[PDB]
Ligand SMILES: CC(C)(COP(=O)(O)OP(=O)(O)OC[C@H]1O[C@@H](n2cnc3c(N)ncnc32)[C@H](O)[C@@H]1OP(=O)(O)O)[C@@H](O)C(=O)NCCC(=O)NCCS
């Protein structure tokens with residue numbers, strides 16, 4: 080049975096505390112005259128339940144690429160040139176940390192699954208990571224582009240069958256990375272479905288190693304991937320929409336998505352999402368803690384977020400002397416979701432600590 | 433063991449014969465005054481071994497979206513809006529025919545793998561195909577974007593593990609679609625490795641059904657997917673390059689790609705099929721992505737192949753051009769269609785073992801080891 084053997088994460092070094100972000104955002108987009116819209120944005124940020132976010136797109140990067148901060152200005156080329164380079168580079172940081180925990184050389188890897196919705200190129204981000212990391216030429220790559228916030232969970236669904244159908248030496252590296260260079264837009268009071276993303280979207284990378292039939296002397300599983308299934312919610316196509324255009328990506332968020340969309344890993348799409356899960360199942364406050372923590376400290380990073388929460392859960396479980404990597408519990412589930420609307424459900428089993 | 437259970441194809445209806453294409457291309461891009469460059473493009477087309485190509489992008493479509501025909505003008509929005517709608521639509525035409533050959537209802541599908549390098553959107557072309565085919569909401573989707581000409585082979589590699597690890601009821605629909613709306617560019621005498629693409633790139637859709645543990649009663653395999661491996665050729669990054677930009681995609685082709693690829697897949701052949709005990713190189717069948725004529729000649733010359741061994745690959749090049757992802761599936765279909773029609777004893781031209789090579793940016797090679805099925 081396939082297992083997660085290592086997890087690690089990375090973020091851009093520039094921290095944006097949410098208390099300061101309305102002032103930063105309306106200043107760098109030169110939109111301070113929009114006082115009513117800033118009031119609304121202040122309330123969005125205050126209700127976001129996000130304490131800080133790590134972002135590539137600083138004031139200096141906007142100054143170097145000024146059309147990124149001018150609504151509707153052509154800036155797709157400028158965003159692309161940044162992201163084709165920087166997305167694999169941040170992924171390499173998380174990947175090498177995961178491989179160090181794993182304890183095996185890159186030569187023991189058989190497969191790479193790379194996921195991002197931040198930039199497209201040919202050859203793709205999977206190839207670029209293999210180049211800058213020095214993955215051997217027999218490492219077999221799968222590129223998952225543009226699948227938004229269920230990409231992390233979908234990589235585990237794919238890795239399960241690859242690991243289990245090819246045998247004991249198959250070892251899959253999963254790397255998920257996003258940079259909001261892809262979809263950062265200046266404010267407009269007729270596009271509130273773009274403005275909500277400015278309050279909650281953020282940058283990050285996470286990596287994991289998956290294998291089956293483990294060398295017990297050298298490898299140690301963290302979780303087992305019991306089953307994985309994707310479903311689509313009917314009649315919800317307009318809930319999450321990303322239109323890649325000459326002005327960059329316009330990523331539209333509907334107000335109904337949370338209303339439509341054991342230990343738990345729930346993609347932190349926003350606070351309404353995590354609350355929807357809690358009261359619906361009578362969950363203790365303890366159950367969503369790890370998902371609430373990643374939302375607070377990193378925001379909604381699309382693809383990699385469920386791996387951040389996975390890593391946070393087993394770390395706290397170990398630090399607090401819990402019985403298993405799943406907070407002392409045996410069974411668990413991870414939910415990724417995104418455009419479609421699409422739900423990826425991954426049934427997990429913890430490991431004894 | 434995973435098997436291909438159905439194969440079908442579709443193309444945009446408008447046919448461009450290669451003898452007429454230099455005239456059309458320089459006229460609709462209002463570039464006839466570039467006389468030396470047009471002579472160069474004529475020679476490119478005359479050497480291409482392409483007789484016709486099916487294209488979505490007609491003169492009317494360019495007239496509706498005139499920046500597509502103006503070099504470096506912003507046209508990415510216009511291209512995107514066309515392809516996000518039209519890529520799934522052409523895929524549905526092929527997919528319906530593959531399911532009809534398969535013979536089972538859509539409700540028996542468990543998975544969909546959609547592959548394209550022609551447009552990006554969220555939700556993507558996989559969701560859109562599901563919606564317009566009315567696939568049940570439990571069909572599990574994988575979207576393979578931007579993998580160029582190895583995408584059809586990579587879909588088989590993925591589908592093998594999905595079908596074999598989940599078992600007898602898992603049935604995977606594969607759909608590969610391309611429309612050169614994505615990268616059509618007007619001519620420039622300083623971007624010649626752009627003009628090559630206008631001589632060879634074309635449009636098409638192919639669909640296949642993959643499953644393991646077959647209902648002998650109702651399902652018949654065409655080919656078995658014995659193994660599949662991707663490899664990367666070191667120090668070949670610049671061989672095939674697609675830069676997606678505000679003017680659309682600029683798809684650059686280095687002069688040495690056919691030889692770098694051809695030498696590599698000859699080596700893969702020797703490395704892979706010698707331990708399987710294939711006695712000589714004419715004793716196995718071949719599907720080689722039709723990137724151009726030179727890569728097909730290399731296989732023939734380096735392995736000493738007879739003329740019938742690359743015939744199916746030459747035919748798809750002649751009649752359809754280089755359609756990127758779906759082309760290897762066109763060739764698979766053609767091979768088994770002619771094998772049946774000509775009275776051969778197997779779907780692989782009367783031979784037991786065979787190879788499929790997809791390749792593309794990286795440079796990346798997807799090798800698929802195939803076994804035919806008795807006819
Ligand atoms: C957006 C969100 C953080 C707001 O926090 P909240 O707990 O709902 O608190 P509020 O209802 O007071 O909302 C605060 C402001 O945000 C607005 N708002 C909330 N959701 C919005 C949405 N999809 N689009 C535009 N504005 C929205 C509210 O109208 C309000 O502005 P106002 O006071 O001027 O009317 C929260 O609703 C949420 O988690 N949304 C989920 C985002 C999502 O869909 N994630 C998954 C897709 S990636």
Ligand SMILES: CC(C)(COP(=O)(O)OP(=O)(O)OC[C@H]1O[C@@H](n2cnc3c(N)ncnc32)[C@H](O)[C@@H]1OP(=O)(O)O)[C@@H](O)C(=O)NCCC(=O)NCCS
Pocket residue numbers: 472475476477479480481581624625626628631632672685686687688689690723724725726754792
């Ligand atoms: C277009 C094509 C059919 C021309 O046929 P050919 O076998 O090269 O015949 P020639 O060598 O006489 O080339 C004719 C012209 O095309 C030019 N040319 C060919 N390939 C070129 C390239 N990558 N870049 C720039 N110019 C090129 C040659 O310089 C030559 O110019 P000239 O006649 O003015 O001297 C062939 O080059 C081809 O198929 N290229 C694509 C192969 C490839 O890269 N496949 C991978 C993509 S999936």
